[PDB]
Design an enzyme around this catalytic site. Structure first.
Site: not given
Ligand SMILES: OC[C@H]1O[C@@H](O)[C@@H](O)[C@@H](O)[C@@H]1O
Ligand SMILES: *[C@@H]1O[C@H](CO)[C@@H](O[C@@H]2O[C@H](CO)[C@@H](O)[C@H](O)[C@H]2NC(C)=O)[C@H](O)[C@H]1NC(C)=O
Ligand SMILES: *[C@@H]1O[C@H](CO[C@@H]2O[C@@H](C)[C@@H](O)[C@@H](O)[C@@H]2O)[C@@H](O)[C@H](O)[C@H]1NC(C)=O
Ligand SMILES: *[C@@H]1O[C@H](CO[C@@H]2O[C@@H](C)[C@@H](O)[C@@H](O)[C@@H]2O)[C@@H](O)[C@H](O)[C@H]1NC(C)=O
Ligand SMILES: *[C@@H]1O[C@H](CO)[C@@H](O)[C@H](O)[C@H]1NC(C)=O
Ligand SMILES: *[C@@H]1O[C@H](CO)[C@@H](O)[C@H](O)[C@H]1NC(C)=O
Ligand SMILES: *[C@@H]1O[C@H](CO)[C@@H](O)[C@H](O)[C@H]1NC(C)=O
Ligand SMILES: [Ca+2]
Length: 862
Positions: A175, A439-440, A537
């Site tokens: 984005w 994050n992730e 999220e």
């Molecule tokens: O990857 C899935 C989502 O994860 C979130 O943490 C961000 O990185 C977003 O930009 C993405 O759309």
């Protein structure tokens, strides 16, 4: 007396690599903003300038300045040069003498210039291209590769952002754009002193159950000029709590740390701190006075907030796994908010005026939580200040996001300074309720996003533990044991730790939190959504208003598939996905004017986004108290995302510039302290009642149906015995569809629409709510509305009186780039006459609004 601190923030000179360019540059400031301000380049956000202005990011720039010191040299033992933030890699030349290097955007630096400073000095910062640097660091890491190497093509970004301790989104994101800039994004100070100098000071309010009283742990590190010992006292006074404490202290070149522990008198009561919508934000003025030998008195003040947080992962009867919810001061609170990304590609342009305005929009949407997403930055001081005073809890990621990172010693050395620096800065804020390692990235290894050979997996697993557990966690817990810590998000919490810090299924709905994204299935079918413990999220994508896009686009760019629109999309097939979700229930715009079609398409995406998220959020709200199929007790909903970093399609509800999307107008509605959610399951219309209040509420429910032709109710089913438990969600109405249609003769799934509301309490906000028995593209009897508006000024607000020819779905009021927002928008207008207000953010007149106004309903799209 023996201390002197004055700022070097002001007008500097910036030059390029080969000196061809040299212009004035403000500090704090970036190169791009200095070039734009001096008129040497267009607005970087204009159309395709993220590709044209790439030369700026690849060149090596230099910040320079010549200054005279306002103090005599012979009167001061030590002189230091302090940087609160340098972005990012730079050699610091003081009087043609290299005094130090930098490589981490997120840590401050201190440099001893006592032997180098003169009466008149010249300070240069020779930056190096963040892009070219990150590549050389990647080439130097030959033992193995660290994915991802380059980003997706549709992001138009740079490679290897994970090899530089810089804002991870600065190399583009799905984005945001690629503007890896250079500059001094924080204050710079000269500080001369004798005897001692306070390098840092930090405090941590805590509650001791073994004492049942509050305590304040304080830690202060000093730098002593002489080798001789230094004595003195320190006094901590909190008058509002009748507290005062004095303790002897001594400092030495080796023993340079002071640790205090102030106990608050149990005789005096202490008012605690609460999130917005659950209590007060009362704090306490506090002073820390150091008094050392030789008459050196160092005083620092700060507000003290008292609050206990607990991340409770307890058991649930009939639900395998562990819960995941927060207890603030012993009370379970449902997180209501979104995810925060950097508000601009250049932080020097994130002024104070912008921040407060953005925080007014967050407040005005009934949010109580914000997640500082790990791909942005550790926000400025005023960001967390506004969180503390307004009562917004903060989920604080560390700036590691969606990527694997190296363990090379130099990198960890840099990461250790960063983490130590940031934790000490931020741990005194009550707003922050949890630390989060990344994050992730737990998912990236669990699922193997980056498709590593199962042979080399062992390596990366160790690097994940080394970074987030052996280092980041080790430092956080050595500084703060008052807040929970999670290695990653989404995670399984305690269960993740049990499995060696990388769970078998981090997306598990039985443990921890989850992120959920779905672009292929019908977003109205709430059965797709996971009934998880906490959703940190979730989000759908939409386009910003034409008013926002107009400022960085040309006339030929205003088509949904134009070269400009596809270039601005940084998500794989984001445009197709959005339209694929619009066709699910609406009719694609069918018009003659390509401009009108373009506007009506944006409008529809924002309609799809708003309704989709409203459906998804409402599902998580009512799932807070029930267990269904071994799943439930959802205690948090933070949707992705809050704001935009530039003008482009995103998951946000605040367009770059602060303008509310239609999603944000729904947010204020579905985040109310008490609202009823409507849905049906296999032909039975249910109505749950969600509560965030602290005591049970006795009110009334009224269900009504309406034919699109006329706004008069064919039904008014009222139930007077309605009680909603405190902070819980329970069903309050149950009736089959065909039965309910027989109660309201003359109604069909495809002809009528359901409406329901609570009884307003005057002192409680509870909006109305609706439910669609069928897709609006299959609706029948939907007369095209014809809305008349009358603008009138009443004080500093404007009144908007409306009259519609029939029931208008998704009425959208838009006054262009006129800063402000409406009291309500995108509503399903059943009534024939409605009045909404407009709150200006800058001075505006009756004619300015009148001229730029335009109303839109659903039928206007085809
Ligand atoms: O990857 C899935 C989502 O994860 C979130 O943490 C961000 O990185 C977003 O930009 C993405 O759309
Ligand atoms: C705590 O300190 C703040 C200062 O930061 C006090 O707020 C000031 O109050 C005076 C008069 O009451 C105003 O003129 C200032 O503008 C205020 N400053 C700010 C920054 O708000 C506050 O009153 C103090 N609280 C107590 C209980 O003493
Ligand atoms: C500047 O100094 C040079 C030698 O000093 C070394 O290089 C400079 C750039 C710094 O990094 C310093 O720390 C090093 O020790 C000279 O070669 C050069 O002629 C000098 N130039 C001027 C204008 O004084
Ligand atoms: C749309 O409406 C316009 C304004 O209508 C006026 O206001 C409404 C509330 C009614 O009271 C109506 O009698 C008034 O004349 C009309 O001028 C216009 O013709 C209507 N239709 C179209 C296609 O614009
Ligand atoms: C400096 O480099 C830029 C690279 O774009 C070039 O355009 C410019 O002519 C160069 N100037 C000199 C004096 O070499
Ligand atoms: C920037 O500096 C690096 C290291 O000195 C160098 O390799 C690179 O060529 C420089 N870039 C430009 C555009 O001069
Ligand atoms: C919270 O603030 C209000 C002022 O609006 C006050 O009446 C109330 O007593 C405060 N609550 C506590 C627990 O001090
Ligand atoms: Ca999980």
């Amino acid at each position: 007396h023996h201390k002197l601190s004055y700022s070097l923030s002001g007008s500097w000179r910036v030059s390029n690599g080969n000196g061809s360019l040299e212009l004035p540059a403000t500090v704090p400031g970036y190169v791009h903003s200095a070039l734009h301000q001096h008129g040497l380049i267009q607005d970087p956000y204009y159309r395709f300038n993220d590709l044209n202005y790439r030369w700026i990011s690849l060149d090596n720039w230099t910040y320079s300045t010549e200054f005279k010191i306002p103090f005599n040299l012979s009167e001061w033992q030590k002189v230091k040069l302090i940087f609160d933030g340098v972005d990012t890699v730079a050699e610091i030349l003081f009087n043609n003498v290299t005094i130090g290097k930098t490589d981490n955007m997120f840590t401050g630096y201190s440099f001893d210039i006592t032997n180098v400073v003169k009466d008149v000095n010249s300070l240069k910062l020779q930056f190096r291209s963040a892009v070219q640097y990150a590549e050389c660091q990647s080439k130097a890491h030959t033992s193995y590769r660290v994915p991802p190497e380059c980003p997706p093509v549709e992001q138009k970004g740079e490679c290897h952002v994970n090899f530089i301790r810089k804002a991870q989104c600065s190399f583009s994101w799905d984005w945001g754009p690629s503007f890896p800039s250079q500059g001094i994004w924080k204050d710079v100070r000269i500080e001369a002193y004798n005897i001692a100098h306070l390098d840092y000071l930090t405090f941590l309010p805590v509650y001791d159950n073994a004492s049942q009283a509050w305590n304040i742990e304080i830690k202060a590190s000093f730098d002593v000029a002489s080798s001789k010992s230094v004595g003195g006292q320190v006094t901590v006074a909190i008058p509002q709590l009748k507290t005062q404490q004095t303790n002897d202290i001594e400092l030495q070149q080796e023993q340079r740390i002071v640790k205090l522990l102030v106990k608050i008198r149990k005789d005096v009561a202490v008012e605690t701190w609460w999130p917005r919508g659950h209590g007060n934000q009362t704090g306490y003025n506090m002073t820390i006075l150091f008094a050392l030998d030789g008459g050196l008195k160092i005083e620092k003040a700060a507000k003290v907030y008292f609050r206990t947080v607990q991340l409770i992962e307890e058991g649930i009867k009939g639900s395998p796994g562990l819960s995941f919810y927060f207890k603030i001061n012993g009370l379970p609170i449902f997180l209501k908010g979104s995810n925060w990304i950097p508000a601009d590609s250049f932080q020097d342009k994130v002024t104070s005026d912008r921040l407060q305005l953005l925080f007014q929009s967050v407040v005005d949407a009934n949010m109580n939580t914000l997640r500082v997403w790990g791909g942005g930055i550790y926000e400025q001081d005023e960001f967390y200040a506004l969180c503390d005073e307004l009562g917004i809890m903060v989920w604080q990621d560390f700036m590691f996001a969606s990527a694997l990172y190296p363990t090379e010693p130099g990198f960890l050395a840099s990461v250790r300074k960063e983490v130590t620096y940031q934790v000490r800065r931020l741990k005194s804020h009550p707003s922050i309720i949890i630390w989060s390692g990344n994050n992730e990235n737990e998912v990236a290894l669990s699922v193997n996003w980056f498709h590593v050979n199962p042979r080399d997996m062992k390596t990366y697993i160790d690097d994940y533990v080394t970074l987030y557990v052996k280092n980041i966690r080790k430092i956080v817990l050595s500084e703060d044991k008052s807040r929970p810590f999670i290695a990653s998000s989404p995670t399984n919490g305690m269960k993740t730790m049990e499995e060696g810090w990388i769970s078998y299924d981090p997306y598990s709905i039985q443990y921890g939190d989850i992120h959920f994204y779905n672009y292929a299935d019908d977003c109205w079918n709430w059965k797709i959504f996971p009934k998880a413990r906490l959703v940190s999220e979730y989000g759908y994508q939409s386009w910003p208003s034409f008013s926002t896009l107009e400022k960085v686009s040309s006339q030929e760019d205003w088509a949904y598939n134009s070269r400009f629109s596809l270039h601005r999309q940084h998500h794989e097939d984001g445009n197709h996905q959005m339209l694929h979700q619009v066709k699910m229930h609406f009719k694609l715009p069918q018009g003659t004017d390509p401009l009108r079609t373009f506007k009506d398409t944006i409008y529809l995406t924002q309609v799809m986004q708003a309704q989709c998220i409203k459906t998804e959020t409402e599902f998580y709200l009512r799932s807070r108290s029930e267990i269904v199929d071994g799943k439930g007790h959802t205690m948090g909903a933070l949707y992705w995302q809050l704001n935009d970093i530039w003008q482009a399609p995103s998951w946000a509800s605040l367009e770059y510039g602060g303008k509310w999307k239609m999603l944000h107008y729904f947010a204020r509605r579905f985040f109310a302290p008490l609202l009823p959610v409507g849905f049906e399951d296999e032909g039975v219309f249910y109505v749950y009642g969600v509560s965030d209040l602290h005591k049970d509420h006795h009110t009334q429910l009224t269900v009504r149906l309406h034919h699109w032709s006329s706004p008069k109710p064919l039904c008014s089913l009222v139930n007077s015995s309605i009680v909603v438990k405190a902070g819980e969600a329970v069903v309050l109405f149950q009736m089959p569809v065909s039965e309910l249609l027989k109660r309201c003769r003359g109604c069909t799934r495809e002809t009528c629409v359901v409406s329901f509301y609570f009884s307003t309490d005057k002192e409680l906000f509870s909006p109305t709510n609706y439910h669609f028995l069928s897709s609006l593209k299959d609706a029948k009897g939907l007369l095209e509305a014809n809305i008349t508006v009358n603008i009138s000024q009443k004080g500093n607000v404007f009144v908007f009186d409306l009259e519609t020819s029939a029931v208008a779905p998704f009425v959208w009021l838009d006054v262009g780039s006129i800063p402000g927002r409406f009291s309500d928008n995108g509503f399903l207008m059943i009534r024939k006459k409605l009045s909404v207000l407009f709150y200006p953010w800058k001075p505006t007149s009756k004619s300015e609004l009148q001229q730029a106004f335009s109303v839109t309903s659903l039928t206007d799209t085809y």
